[PDB]
Design a protein around this ligand. Structure first.
Ligand code: ACP
Ligand code: MG
Length: 214
């Protein structure tokens, strides 16, 4: 019996779309900082659930462990960053991951044009989009307490989609699945991941574990 799923498509805010095009169609060295940006997001989300659970300990019913997992998959060429942080509601996804303007976007594009290192992306308030330095497509699966599990996805080009996720349930948190570009497969290698975590993500505040398939 055929299943029916609803999909909603959203336009990125105009300057966010411009930034994504810049990131994708311009050569930048030092792309490895994408992972720092994603781990920083996870750490921030872990702080949020940690503090919320001081007010309401039942907010940890959906899982007490506060941690980050990194999962390279050489078979399907994906690198996944999973956290057990606060997650995002549907409204959070739509608002926070593309539709609302960020005040630093224009300044950042000017900085890049003038030769700034791509590592400055976080300072300008748009760190997530560093994912597109290495990924041709990004899928974000997320589960916030008191809301359903959702999947956000974009291959850039000006829009993203959101749908209720009918895949494997997560208790609470977010998974960012990077479908790596063919020339960026170094980020599936355990040595390289270890190197960049050590270099850029030394003060995370939560355990991080790298899972490596035999
Ligand atoms: N792992 C995650 N868990 C929960 N929310 C996340 C998330 N990753 C991203 N987000 C949401 O997406 C927003 C945008 O993330 P982004 O990294 O671009 O900016 P930011 O708010 O972290 C400032 P910065 O530029 O310093 O990183 C976050 O503020 C948060 O609301
Ligand atoms: Mg961030």
């Amino acid at each position: 019996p055929m299943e029916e799923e609803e999909v909603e498509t959203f336009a990125f805010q105009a300057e966010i779309a411009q930034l994504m095009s810049l990131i994708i169609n311009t050569f930048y060295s030092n792309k490895e900082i994408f992972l720092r940006e994603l781990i920083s997001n996870s750490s921030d989300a872990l702080d949020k659930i940690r503090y919320e659970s001081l007010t309401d300990p039942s907010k940890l019913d959906s899982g007490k462990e506060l941690h980050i997992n990194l999962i390279p998959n050489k078979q399907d060429r994906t690198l996944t960053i999973v956290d057990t942080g606060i997650g995002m509601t549907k409204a959070d996804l739509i608002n926070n991951l593309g539709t609302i303007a960020k005040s630093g976007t224009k300044a950042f594009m000017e900085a890049l044009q003038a030769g700034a290192d791509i590592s400055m992306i976080g300072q300008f308030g748009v760190g997530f989009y560093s994912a597109y330095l290495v990924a041709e497509k990004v899928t974000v699966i997320t589960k916030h307490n008191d809301d359903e599990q959702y999947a956000w996805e974009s291959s850039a080009g000006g829009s993203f989609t959101v749908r209720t996720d009918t895949g494997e349930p997560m208790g609470r948190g977010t998974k960012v699945i990077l479908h790596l570009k063919e020339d960026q497969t170094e980020y599936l290698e355990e040595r390289r991941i270890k190197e960049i975590v050590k270099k850029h993500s030394q003060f995370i505040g939560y355990p991080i574990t790298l899972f490596v398939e035999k």
